[PDB]
Amino acid sequence: ARVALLADRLRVEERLLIEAFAARGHEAVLVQPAKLALSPAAPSAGDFVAALDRGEATAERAVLAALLASGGTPVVNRAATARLLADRMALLRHLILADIPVPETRVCFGEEAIFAAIAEIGYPVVLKSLTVDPGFPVALVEDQDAAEAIVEHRIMLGGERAVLVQQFIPARAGQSVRLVVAGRSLAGIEQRTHTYEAYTGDPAPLTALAERIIERLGTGTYAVEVVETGDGPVVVGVANLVDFRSLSGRGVDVAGMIADFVLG
Amino acid sequence: ARVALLADRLRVEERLLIEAFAARGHEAVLVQPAKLALSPAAPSAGDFVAALDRGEATAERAVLAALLASGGTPVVNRAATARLLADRMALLRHLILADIPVPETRVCFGEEAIFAAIAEIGYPVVLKSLTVDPGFPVALVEDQDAAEAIVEHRIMERAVLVQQFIPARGQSVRLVVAGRSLAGIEQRTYEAYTGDPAPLTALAERIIERLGTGTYAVEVVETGDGPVVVGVANLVDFRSLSGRGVDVAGMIADFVLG
């Protein structure tokens, strides 16, 4: 019985998982998705009892999780959750329906709409493609000169016109909170060092937020980016739990929890 | 009582649709998606009884269909049908489950997987992005030279469908679904289909059951073993079919107003 680690190369997190899976009686194996040519009639990546996606959440990895799952190989994160990590639009509507606070957002399907939303929301804002895409990273827009620049760059770089115009809530570095969910429970709370450091504040309110997120969004291996405000916390995004190096450093057995969540 | 025509500009098809809705007591209004900045809480493109998407089916259009429907504006195609027009992967799986013949396909998540699949099925093959993208059109690969050329081109999106390309004389047909039924069959010169419509009419009925009712065109290649479904797209063009006295705009309007 083996376990597939969907990744391109083994890093620190990947070898910690190979220990935790070996400690639990399973041989974790690096499976590079670049070499996967799956057949829709019977998709499979080899003999595996489970697959664990160790890559950045994108649209085709949700496709990969759905194909493998339909073929008999369970995948973490499950396809539907991987879709919420890959699709900012689907995640946004899911958090809204769950009554979880998110920044003011507009869905804009053209250049005019983008400036229409920028006028209504007011500077600053961020432009986010509806689907997580490395070719279009999140774009901060402080003023109209910044707006005319990114809008010109995207018109010039192709035609995936629809973007999200989202209000920017600046954080004093210590309010750049990251809620680490390692399967079934909150593995820890961290804060960015403007590179994740242990949270040095009241952890109960963020724990309550993470517990609602797990209850409504589901269990999995992911990290919720949160920004603390004077009105309360605000969820800005969710991503796959790729970096749990820092949290494992402080004795939190993140890899063990993940290995437990994968085999059950 | 106004209907939104989601399009960048009015062409002959949109003009035929404006008259069809007018003949049915409704004003069809051009609504350019470029100006639409929708609030996710309660999205709205204006006061419209329905929206009819007149553009190419992409993931953004499936999102737009789901958005406007969430706020109380029904959309044709509906979001579930729009998604299958935009998601070649979802369409592939959905047609396979209904035993509807589709070309041999491999889902490849990297460069090494593409050439592995190309070798497994043969030449020629075709390269299709997982979702319909106008910046990555369907790519025909005749030999290992054109294969390695287009692979390098894209890496300047790291997952594609590799699909066996089926040639056709003539024998490449188009099923036109205009609302709730098949409006006609055409063949590639598009002109009127000159074979026997019988097997394609039975296939069209099975397609409609899988994709749902809507406005779309099914690309079919009639081979020796039988008909094979290559793809499905939004019914952007229907000028010639109207010319032959098939009231496509009228059927679409009745489908929208119900």
Short mmCIF file of C-alpha atoms in Angstrom, two decimals:
data_model
loop_
_atom_site.label_atom_id
_atom_site.label_comp_id
_atom_site.label_asym_id
_atom_site.label_seq_id
_atom_site.Cartn_x
_atom_site.Cartn_y
_atom_site.Cartn_z
CA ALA A 1 0.00 0.00 0.00
CA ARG A 2 1.47 3.30 -1.19
CA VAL A 3 0.57 7.00 -1.24
CA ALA A 4 1.13 9.40 -4.14
CA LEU A 5 2.69 12.83 -3.46
CA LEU A 6 1.57 14.93 -6.44
CA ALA A 7 4.58 17.24 -6.70
CA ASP A 8 7.40 18.10 -9.06
CA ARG A 9 10.27 17.56 -6.59
CA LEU A 10 10.70 16.59 -2.95
CA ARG A 11 11.31 19.53 -0.61
CA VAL A 12 11.38 19.71 3.20
CA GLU A 13 7.61 19.31 3.58
CA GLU A 14 7.60 16.33 1.20
CA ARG A 15 10.23 14.38 3.13
CA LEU A 16 8.51 15.06 6.47
CA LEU A 17 5.40 13.50 4.93
CA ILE A 18 7.42 10.51 3.72
CA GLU A 19 8.47 9.96 7.35
CA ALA A 20 4.92 10.33 8.68
CA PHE A 21 3.50 8.00 6.03
CA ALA A 22 6.31 5.49 6.61
CA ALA A 23 5.67 5.70 10.36
CA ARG A 24 2.02 4.80 9.62
CA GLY A 25 2.84 1.84 7.38
CA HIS A 26 2.63 3.36 3.89
CA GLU A 27 5.29 4.16 1.29
CA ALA A 28 4.85 7.73 0.09
CA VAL A 29 6.04 8.16 -3.50
CA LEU A 30 6.82 11.27 -5.53
CA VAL A 31 4.45 11.33 -8.52
CA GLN A 32 5.24 14.13 -10.95
CA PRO A 33 2.05 15.37 -12.67
CA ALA A 34 4.08 16.48 -15.70
CA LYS A 35 4.36 12.80 -16.70
CA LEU A 36 0.66 11.98 -16.16
CA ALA A 37 -1.32 11.19 -19.33
CA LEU A 38 -4.64 10.01 -17.89
CA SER A 39 -7.33 8.09 -19.76
CA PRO A 40 -10.87 9.40 -19.11
CA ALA A 41 -12.40 5.92 -19.41
CA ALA A 42 -10.19 4.63 -16.56
CA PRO A 43 -7.97 7.33 -15.02
CA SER A 44 -5.12 6.28 -12.75
CA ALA A 45 -1.62 7.38 -11.80
CA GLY A 46 -0.50 3.95 -10.56
CA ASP A 47 -1.31 1.66 -7.67
CA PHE A 48 -2.08 4.03 -4.79
CA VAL A 49 -4.53 4.03 -1.90
CA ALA A 50 -4.51 7.85 -1.88
CA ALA A 51 -2.96 10.90 -3.54
CA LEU A 52 -1.91 14.11 -1.81
CA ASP A 53 -1.61 17.20 -4.01
CA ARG A 54 1.50 19.07 -2.88
CA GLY A 55 1.26 21.73 -5.59
CA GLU A 56 -0.18 25.21 -5.91
CA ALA A 57 -3.95 25.14 -6.33
CA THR A 58 -4.94 25.70 -9.96
CA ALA A 59 -7.76 24.73 -12.30
CA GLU A 60 -6.08 21.67 -13.82
CA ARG A 61 -5.15 20.24 -10.43
CA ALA A 62 -8.83 20.26 -9.49
CA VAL A 63 -9.29 18.47 -12.82
CA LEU A 64 -6.56 16.04 -11.74
CA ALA A 65 -8.16 15.43 -8.33
CA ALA A 66 -11.53 14.76 -9.97
CA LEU A 67 -10.11 12.36 -12.56
CA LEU A 68 -8.09 10.38 -10.02
CA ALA A 69 -11.03 10.22 -7.59
CA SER A 70 -13.45 8.96 -10.26
CA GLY A 71 -10.88 6.27 -11.13
CA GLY A 72 -10.62 4.90 -7.58
CA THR A 73 -7.78 7.01 -6.13
CA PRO A 74 -8.93 9.41 -3.39
CA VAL A 75 -7.17 12.78 -3.55
CA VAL A 76 -6.46 15.34 -0.84
CA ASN A 77 -7.57 17.93 -1.33
CA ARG A 78 -10.80 16.46 -2.68
CA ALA A 79 -11.78 17.78 -6.10
CA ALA A 80 -14.55 20.08 -4.85
CA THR A 81 -12.26 21.70 -2.27
CA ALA A 82 -9.44 21.96 -4.82
CA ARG A 83 -11.94 23.79 -7.04
CA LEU A 84 -12.61 26.33 -4.28
CA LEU A 85 -8.87 26.92 -3.88
CA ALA A 86 -8.45 27.28 -7.66
CA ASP A 87 -11.55 29.39 -8.35
CA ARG A 88 -11.67 32.74 -6.56
CA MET A 89 -15.22 33.25 -7.84
CA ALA A 90 -16.57 29.97 -6.47
CA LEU A 91 -14.74 30.51 -3.17
CA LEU A 92 -16.13 34.05 -2.96
CA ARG A 93 -19.73 32.94 -3.45
CA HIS A 94 -19.24 30.07 -0.98
CA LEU A 95 -17.89 32.34 1.78
CA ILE A 96 -20.70 34.86 1.19
CA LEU A 97 -23.36 32.15 1.47
CA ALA A 98 -21.60 30.94 4.65
CA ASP A 99 -21.81 34.47 6.17
CA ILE A 100 -18.00 34.64 6.42
CA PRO A 101 -16.61 38.19 6.05
CA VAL A 102 -14.75 38.94 2.80
CA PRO A 103 -13.54 42.21 1.28
CA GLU A 104 -15.86 44.27 -0.87
CA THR A 105 -15.66 42.74 -4.34
CA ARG A 106 -16.99 43.34 -7.84
CA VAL A 107 -16.98 40.87 -10.73
CA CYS A 108 -15.98 42.87 -13.81
CA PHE A 109 -16.19 41.41 -17.31
CA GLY A 110 -14.47 44.27 -19.16
CA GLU A 111 -12.24 47.32 -18.94
CA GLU A 112 -15.09 49.79 -18.42
CA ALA A 113 -16.58 47.66 -15.63
CA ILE A 114 -13.17 47.53 -13.92
CA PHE A 115 -13.02 51.32 -13.74
CA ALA A 116 -16.71 51.40 -12.79
CA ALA A 117 -15.98 49.16 -9.79
CA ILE A 118 -12.84 51.15 -8.92
CA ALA A 119 -14.92 54.33 -8.76
CA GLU A 120 -17.49 52.68 -6.47
CA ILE A 121 -15.07 50.86 -4.16
CA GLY A 122 -12.43 53.60 -4.19
CA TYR A 123 -8.65 53.19 -4.11
CA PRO A 124 -6.83 51.08 -3.29
CA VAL A 125 -8.04 47.80 -4.83
CA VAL A 126 -6.55 44.52 -6.08
CA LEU A 127 -7.22 42.80 -9.41
CA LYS A 128 -7.64 39.03 -9.16
CA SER A 129 -8.32 36.69 -12.05
CA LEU A 130 -11.36 34.50 -11.42
CA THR A 131 -9.05 31.46 -11.48
CA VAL A 132 -5.70 31.28 -9.69
CA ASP A 133 -3.11 31.69 -12.42
CA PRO A 134 0.66 32.29 -12.10
CA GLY A 135 0.59 34.26 -15.37
CA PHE A 136 -1.70 36.81 -13.67
CA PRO A 137 -0.60 37.39 -10.07
CA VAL A 138 -2.66 39.57 -7.76
CA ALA A 139 -2.21 43.20 -8.79
CA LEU A 140 -2.31 46.11 -6.33
CA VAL A 141 -3.84 49.33 -7.69
CA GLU A 142 -3.25 52.45 -5.61
CA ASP A 143 -4.37 55.08 -8.15
CA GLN A 144 -5.60 55.54 -11.71
CA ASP A 145 -2.07 55.46 -13.15
CA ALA A 146 -1.66 52.01 -11.60
CA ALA A 147 -5.11 51.07 -12.92
CA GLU A 148 -4.41 52.17 -16.50
CA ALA A 149 -1.13 50.24 -16.38
CA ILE A 150 -2.42 46.79 -15.40
CA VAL A 151 -5.52 47.13 -17.59
CA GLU A 152 -3.22 47.98 -20.50
CA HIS A 153 -0.90 45.07 -19.64
CA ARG A 154 -3.73 42.52 -19.67
CA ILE A 155 -5.32 43.79 -22.90
CA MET A 156 -1.84 43.49 -24.41
CA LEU A 157 -1.19 40.02 -22.98
CA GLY A 158 -4.24 38.21 -24.37
CA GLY A 159 -7.91 38.05 -23.48
CA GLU A 160 -9.07 36.57 -20.17
CA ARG A 161 -11.09 39.71 -19.63
CA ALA A 162 -13.03 38.95 -16.44
CA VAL A 163 -11.29 39.98 -13.19
CA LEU A 164 -12.28 40.66 -9.59
CA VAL A 165 -11.95 44.25 -8.36
CA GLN A 166 -11.53 43.79 -4.61
CA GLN A 167 -11.05 46.39 -1.90
CA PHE A 168 -7.58 46.40 -0.37
CA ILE A 169 -7.36 46.15 3.42
CA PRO A 170 -3.74 46.92 4.42
CA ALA A 171 -2.28 45.00 7.35
CA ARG A 172 0.54 46.04 9.68
CA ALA A 173 2.45 42.82 8.83
CA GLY A 174 1.40 41.41 12.23
CA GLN A 175 -2.22 41.40 11.01
CA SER A 176 -1.29 39.28 7.95
CA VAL A 177 -2.63 36.14 9.61
CA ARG A 178 -2.49 32.66 8.06
CA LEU A 179 -4.81 29.96 9.46
CA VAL A 180 -3.23 26.54 8.85
CA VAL A 181 -5.76 23.71 8.53
CA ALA A 182 -3.97 20.35 8.48
CA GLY A 183 -6.87 18.05 7.72
CA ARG A 184 -9.50 18.04 10.45
CA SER A 185 -8.42 20.84 12.81
CA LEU A 186 -6.53 24.13 13.03
CA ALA A 187 -2.86 23.17 13.22
CA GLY A 188 -1.75 26.69 14.11
CA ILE A 189 -2.02 30.41 13.53
CA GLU A 190 0.79 32.39 11.92
CA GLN A 191 1.62 35.95 10.87
CA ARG A 192 3.73 37.14 7.95
CA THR A 193 7.11 38.82 8.51
CA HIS A 194 7.11 41.72 6.04
CA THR A 195 8.18 33.82 6.22
CA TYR A 196 5.48 32.88 8.74
CA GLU A 197 5.89 33.51 12.48
CA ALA A 198 3.76 32.27 15.38
CA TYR A 199 0.82 34.54 16.12
CA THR A 200 1.48 36.78 19.12
CA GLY A 201 -2.07 37.87 19.91
CA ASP A 202 -5.42 36.61 21.20
CA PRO A 203 -5.80 33.25 19.40
CA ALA A 204 -9.43 32.47 20.42
CA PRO A 205 -11.21 34.72 17.87
CA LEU A 206 -9.15 33.43 14.93
CA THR A 207 -9.65 29.86 16.19
CA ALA A 208 -13.42 30.42 16.12
CA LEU A 209 -13.14 31.72 12.55
CA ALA A 210 -11.05 28.74 11.45
CA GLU A 211 -13.57 26.36 13.03
CA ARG A 212 -16.44 27.90 11.06
CA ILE A 213 -14.35 27.71 7.88
CA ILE A 214 -13.69 24.01 8.44
CA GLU A 215 -17.38 23.43 9.22
CA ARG A 216 -18.68 25.20 6.10
CA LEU A 217 -15.85 24.93 3.55
CA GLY A 218 -14.81 21.43 4.64
CA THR A 219 -11.80 19.56 5.96
CA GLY A 220 -8.53 19.51 4.05
CA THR A 221 -4.94 20.68 3.91
CA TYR A 222 -5.10 24.42 3.25
CA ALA A 223 -4.21 27.87 4.59
CA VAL A 224 -6.66 30.76 4.99
CA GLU A 225 -5.17 34.21 4.44
CA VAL A 226 -6.83 36.60 6.90
CA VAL A 227 -6.50 40.33 7.57
CA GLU A 228 -7.44 41.66 11.00
CA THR A 229 -9.43 44.90 11.14
CA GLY A 230 -11.15 47.05 13.75
CA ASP A 231 -14.48 45.54 12.67
CA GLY A 232 -13.25 41.93 12.77
CA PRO A 233 -11.21 39.47 10.72
CA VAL A 234 -11.69 39.35 6.95
CA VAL A 235 -10.90 36.35 4.74
CA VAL A 236 -8.88 37.35 1.67
CA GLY A 237 -8.15 33.94 0.14
CA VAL A 238 -7.50 30.24 0.66
CA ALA A 239 -4.63 28.20 -0.79
CA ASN A 240 -3.23 24.68 -0.65
CA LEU A 241 -1.06 23.88 2.37
CA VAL A 242 2.23 23.91 0.48
CA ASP A 243 4.49 25.53 3.11
CA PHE A 244 4.22 24.08 6.60
CA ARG A 245 7.97 24.35 7.23
CA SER A 246 7.79 27.07 9.88
CA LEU A 247 4.93 25.44 11.80
CA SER A 248 6.69 22.06 11.87
CA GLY A 249 9.69 23.89 13.33
CA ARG A 250 7.76 24.75 16.50
CA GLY A 251 7.02 21.09 17.25
CA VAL A 252 3.58 21.09 15.63
CA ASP A 253 3.38 17.68 13.93
CA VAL A 254 1.79 19.09 10.78
CA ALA A 255 2.99 16.21 8.60
CA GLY A 256 1.59 13.69 11.07
CA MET A 257 -1.85 15.31 11.06
CA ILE A 258 -1.87 15.35 7.26
CA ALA A 259 -0.85 11.69 7.09
CA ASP A 260 -3.66 10.89 9.53
CA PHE A 261 -6.19 12.87 7.48
CA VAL A 262 -5.16 11.05 4.28
CA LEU A 263 -5.45 7.51 5.70
CA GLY A 264 -8.60 6.64 7.63
CA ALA B 1 -40.45 43.16 -20.35
CA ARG B 2 -36.94 43.42 -21.83
CA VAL B 3 -34.43 40.72 -22.76
CA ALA B 4 -30.67 41.22 -22.52
CA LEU B 5 -28.56 40.25 -25.54
CA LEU B 6 -25.12 39.65 -24.02
CA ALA B 7 -22.83 40.57 -26.91
CA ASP B 8 -20.22 43.10 -27.94
CA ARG B 9 -22.14 44.21 -31.04
CA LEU B 10 -25.31 43.56 -33.03
CA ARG B 11 -24.83 41.30 -36.05
CA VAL B 12 -27.44 39.77 -38.36
CA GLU B 13 -28.20 37.06 -35.80
CA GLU B 14 -28.90 39.61 -33.07
CA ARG B 15 -31.06 41.59 -35.49
CA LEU B 16 -33.12 38.48 -36.27
CA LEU B 17 -33.45 37.92 -32.51
CA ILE B 18 -34.60 41.48 -31.82
CA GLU B 19 -37.42 41.04 -34.34
CA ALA B 20 -38.35 37.61 -32.98
CA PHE B 21 -38.67 39.03 -29.46
CA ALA B 22 -40.52 42.08 -30.82
CA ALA B 23 -42.98 39.78 -32.61
CA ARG B 24 -43.49 38.27 -29.14
CA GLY B 25 -44.04 41.59 -27.36
CA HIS B 26 -40.55 41.96 -25.85
CA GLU B 27 -37.73 44.45 -26.40
CA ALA B 28 -34.34 42.79 -26.83
CA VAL B 29 -31.53 45.16 -25.79
CA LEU B 30 -27.81 44.85 -26.50
CA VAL B 31 -25.97 44.45 -23.18
CA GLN B 32 -22.21 44.51 -23.61
CA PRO B 33 -20.49 42.35 -20.95
CA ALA B 34 -17.50 44.73 -20.89
CA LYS B 35 -19.61 47.24 -18.93
CA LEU B 36 -20.92 44.68 -16.41
CA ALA B 37 -19.50 45.12 -12.88
CA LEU B 38 -21.66 42.75 -10.84
CA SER B 39 -21.93 42.61 -7.06
CA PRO B 40 -21.58 38.97 -5.93
CA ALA B 41 -24.12 39.46 -3.13
CA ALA B 42 -26.98 40.20 -5.56
CA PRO B 43 -25.82 40.51 -9.19
CA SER B 44 -27.89 42.30 -11.80
CA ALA B 45 -27.31 43.62 -15.32
CA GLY B 46 -30.43 45.80 -15.26
CA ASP B 47 -34.15 45.13 -15.31
CA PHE B 48 -34.47 42.15 -17.66
CA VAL B 49 -36.78 39.15 -17.71
CA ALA B 50 -33.95 37.06 -19.19
CA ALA B 51 -30.47 37.25 -20.68
CA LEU B 52 -29.39 35.45 -23.86
CA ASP B 53 -25.64 34.92 -24.24
CA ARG B 54 -24.59 35.62 -27.83
CA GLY B 55 -20.82 35.24 -27.40
CA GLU B 56 -18.31 32.41 -27.52
CA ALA B 57 -18.72 30.00 -24.60
CA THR B 58 -15.82 30.42 -22.16
CA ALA B 59 -15.39 29.88 -18.42
CA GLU B 60 -16.12 33.59 -17.87
CA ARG B 61 -19.45 33.18 -19.68
CA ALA B 62 -20.38 30.16 -17.55
CA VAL B 63 -19.61 32.28 -14.48
CA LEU B 64 -21.66 35.15 -15.92
CA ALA B 65 -24.60 32.79 -16.48
CA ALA B 66 -24.42 31.52 -12.90
CA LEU B 67 -24.02 35.07 -11.57
CA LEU B 68 -26.98 36.69 -13.33
CA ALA B 69 -29.19 33.68 -12.58
CA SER B 70 -28.30 33.98 -8.87
CA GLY B 71 -29.78 37.49 -8.81
CA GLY B 72 -33.03 36.49 -10.50
CA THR B 73 -32.22 36.99 -14.20
CA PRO B 74 -32.50 33.65 -16.05
CA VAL B 75 -29.80 33.11 -18.64
CA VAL B 76 -29.74 31.10 -21.85
CA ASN B 77 -27.68 29.06 -22.01
CA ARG B 78 -28.20 28.16 -18.37
CA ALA B 79 -25.01 28.00 -16.33
CA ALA B 80 -24.92 24.19 -16.20
CA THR B 81 -25.22 24.00 -20.00
CA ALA B 82 -22.82 26.93 -20.45
CA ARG B 83 -20.23 25.13 -18.31
CA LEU B 84 -20.29 22.06 -20.59
CA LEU B 85 -19.84 24.32 -23.62
CA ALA B 86 -16.82 25.93 -21.93
CA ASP B 87 -15.30 22.93 -20.13
CA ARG B 88 -13.99 20.46 -22.71
CA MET B 89 -13.01 18.14 -19.85
CA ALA B 90 -16.46 18.19 -18.30
CA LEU B 91 -18.03 17.76 -21.74
CA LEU B 92 -15.73 14.80 -22.50
CA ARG B 93 -16.62 13.00 -19.27
CA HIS B 94 -20.32 13.80 -19.67
CA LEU B 95 -20.57 12.39 -23.20
CA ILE B 96 -18.58 9.27 -22.25
CA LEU B 97 -21.09 8.43 -19.51
CA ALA B 98 -23.90 8.42 -22.11
CA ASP B 99 -22.04 6.15 -24.56
CA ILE B 100 -21.88 8.98 -27.10
CA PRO B 101 -18.88 8.38 -29.40
CA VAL B 102 -16.04 10.88 -28.93
CA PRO B 103 -12.47 10.75 -30.27
CA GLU B 104 -9.77 8.93 -28.34
CA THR B 105 -8.54 11.40 -25.73
CA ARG B 106 -5.81 11.54 -23.09
CA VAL B 107 -5.65 14.14 -20.31
CA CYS B 108 -2.01 15.27 -20.14
CA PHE B 109 -0.68 17.40 -17.29
CA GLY B 110 2.80 18.14 -18.64
CA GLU B 111 5.11 18.11 -21.63
CA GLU B 112 6.34 14.54 -21.16
CA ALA B 113 2.72 13.35 -20.89
CA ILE B 114 1.75 15.05 -24.16
CA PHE B 115 4.37 13.23 -26.24
CA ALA B 116 3.60 10.00 -24.38
CA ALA B 117 -0.05 10.25 -25.43
CA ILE B 118 0.86 11.32 -28.97
CA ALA B 119 2.84 8.10 -29.33
CA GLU B 120 0.13 5.92 -27.80
CA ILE B 121 -2.68 6.91 -30.19
CA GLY B 122 -0.78 7.92 -33.35
CA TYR B 123 -0.89 10.76 -35.85
CA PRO B 124 -2.61 13.01 -36.44
CA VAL B 125 -3.60 14.38 -33.03
CA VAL B 126 -5.16 17.64 -31.87
CA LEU B 127 -4.29 19.77 -28.82
CA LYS B 128 -7.21 21.24 -26.87
CA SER B 129 -6.97 23.35 -23.73
CA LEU B 130 -9.09 22.01 -20.88
CA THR B 131 -11.46 25.00 -21.09
CA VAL B 132 -12.33 27.00 -24.19
CA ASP B 133 -9.72 29.76 -24.47
CA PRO B 134 -9.44 32.11 -27.47
CA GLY B 135 -5.75 32.60 -26.64
CA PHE B 136 -5.08 28.87 -27.11
CA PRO B 137 -7.04 27.76 -30.18
CA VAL B 138 -7.35 24.11 -31.14
CA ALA B 139 -3.99 22.97 -32.51
CA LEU B 140 -3.65 20.27 -35.17
CA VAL B 141 -0.45 18.21 -34.95
CA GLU B 142 0.45 16.32 -38.13
CA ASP B 143 4.01 15.18 -37.32
CA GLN B 144 6.54 15.18 -34.49
CA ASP B 145 7.86 18.49 -35.87
CA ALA B 146 4.60 20.40 -35.36
CA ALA B 147 4.21 18.59 -32.02
CA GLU B 148 7.42 19.96 -30.49
CA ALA B 149 6.74 23.39 -32.02
CA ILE B 150 3.35 24.02 -30.41
CA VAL B 151 4.49 22.55 -27.07
CA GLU B 152 7.23 25.19 -26.86
CA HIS B 153 4.76 27.85 -28.04
CA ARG B 154 2.41 27.36 -25.08
CA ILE B 155 5.21 27.53 -22.48
CA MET B 156 5.56 31.26 -23.22
CA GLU B 157 -1.30 26.65 -18.89
CA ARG B 158 0.41 23.28 -18.40
CA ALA B 159 -2.36 20.77 -19.13
CA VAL B 160 -4.02 19.81 -22.41
CA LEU B 161 -6.28 17.20 -23.93
CA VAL B 162 -4.50 15.15 -26.58
CA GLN B 163 -7.17 13.91 -28.96
CA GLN B 164 -7.09 11.72 -32.05
CA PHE B 165 -7.87 13.98 -35.01
CA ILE B 166 -10.41 12.44 -37.39
CA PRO B 167 -10.27 13.60 -41.04
CA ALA B 168 -13.40 14.20 -43.09
CA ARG B 169 -14.30 14.68 -46.75
CA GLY B 170 -18.45 16.93 -46.66
CA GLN B 171 -18.90 14.27 -43.98
CA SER B 172 -18.26 16.78 -41.15
CA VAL B 173 -21.71 17.85 -39.98
CA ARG B 174 -23.23 20.28 -37.48
CA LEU B 175 -26.30 19.66 -35.31
CA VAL B 176 -28.10 22.95 -34.64
CA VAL B 177 -30.07 22.96 -31.38
CA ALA B 178 -32.22 26.11 -31.17
CA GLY B 179 -33.86 25.94 -27.77
CA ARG B 180 -35.69 22.71 -27.00
CA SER B 181 -35.22 20.75 -30.24
CA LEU B 182 -32.97 20.17 -33.24
CA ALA B 183 -33.49 22.98 -35.76
CA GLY B 184 -31.55 21.45 -38.63
CA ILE B 185 -28.42 19.66 -39.75
CA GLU B 186 -25.65 21.30 -41.75
CA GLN B 187 -22.43 20.05 -43.31
CA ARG B 188 -19.10 21.75 -43.91
CA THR B 189 -18.65 23.31 -47.34
CA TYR B 190 -21.65 25.37 -43.67
CA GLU B 191 -24.41 24.17 -46.03
CA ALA B 192 -27.50 21.99 -45.75
CA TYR B 193 -26.84 18.34 -44.93
CA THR B 194 -27.29 16.09 -47.96
CA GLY B 195 -27.07 12.61 -46.40
CA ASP B 196 -29.81 10.82 -44.51
CA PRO B 197 -30.67 12.69 -41.29
CA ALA B 198 -31.89 9.54 -39.49
CA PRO B 199 -28.84 8.50 -37.39
CA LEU B 200 -27.93 12.13 -36.65
CA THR B 201 -31.48 12.91 -35.52
CA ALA B 202 -31.34 10.05 -33.01
CA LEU B 203 -27.90 11.23 -31.89
CA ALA B 204 -29.11 14.83 -31.54
CA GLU B 205 -31.85 13.65 -29.19
CA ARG B 206 -29.28 11.92 -26.98
CA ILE B 207 -27.02 15.00 -27.02
CA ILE B 208 -29.87 17.30 -25.95
CA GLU B 209 -30.64 14.95 -23.05
CA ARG B 210 -27.03 15.22 -21.84
CA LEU B 211 -26.27 18.92 -22.37
CA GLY B 212 -29.81 20.12 -21.68
CA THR B 213 -31.88 22.38 -23.86
CA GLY B 214 -30.24 25.54 -25.12
CA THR B 215 -28.77 27.26 -28.16
CA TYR B 216 -25.69 25.39 -29.37
CA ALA B 217 -24.07 23.56 -32.28
CA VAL B 218 -22.62 20.04 -32.10
CA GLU B 219 -19.66 19.27 -34.35
CA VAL B 220 -19.99 15.69 -35.63
CA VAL B 221 -17.77 13.68 -37.99
CA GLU B 222 -19.53 10.80 -39.77
CA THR B 223 -17.02 7.95 -40.04
CA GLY B 224 -17.28 4.39 -41.28
CA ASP B 225 -17.99 2.96 -37.83
CA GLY B 226 -20.52 5.73 -37.18
CA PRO B 227 -20.88 9.32 -36.01
CA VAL B 228 -18.34 10.76 -33.57
CA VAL B 229 -18.93 13.96 -31.58
CA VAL B 230 -15.94 16.31 -31.70
CA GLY B 231 -17.19 19.35 -29.78
CA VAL B 232 -20.09 21.62 -28.89
CA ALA B 233 -20.21 25.42 -29.09
CA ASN B 234 -22.68 28.25 -28.54
CA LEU B 235 -25.00 28.94 -31.49
CA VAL B 236 -23.28 32.13 -32.55
CA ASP B 237 -23.99 31.79 -36.29
CA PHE B 238 -27.33 30.79 -37.81
CA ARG B 239 -27.71 33.23 -40.75
CA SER B 240 -27.89 30.65 -43.53
CA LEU B 241 -30.35 28.39 -41.69
CA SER B 242 -32.73 31.35 -41.33
CA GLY B 243 -32.26 31.99 -45.05
CA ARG B 244 -33.64 28.50 -45.79
CA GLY B 245 -36.79 29.37 -43.83
CA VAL B 246 -35.87 27.86 -40.45
CA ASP B 247 -36.95 30.38 -37.81
CA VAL B 248 -33.99 29.83 -35.50
CA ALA B 249 -34.33 33.26 -33.88
CA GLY B 250 -38.02 32.55 -33.33
CA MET B 251 -37.39 29.19 -31.67
CA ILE B 252 -34.68 30.73 -29.50
CA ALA B 253 -37.03 33.55 -28.47
CA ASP B 254 -39.79 31.11 -27.51
CA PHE B 255 -37.16 29.16 -25.56
CA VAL B 256 -36.06 32.30 -23.70
CA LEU B 257 -39.61 33.48 -22.95
CA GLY B 258 -40.45 30.15 -21.29
#
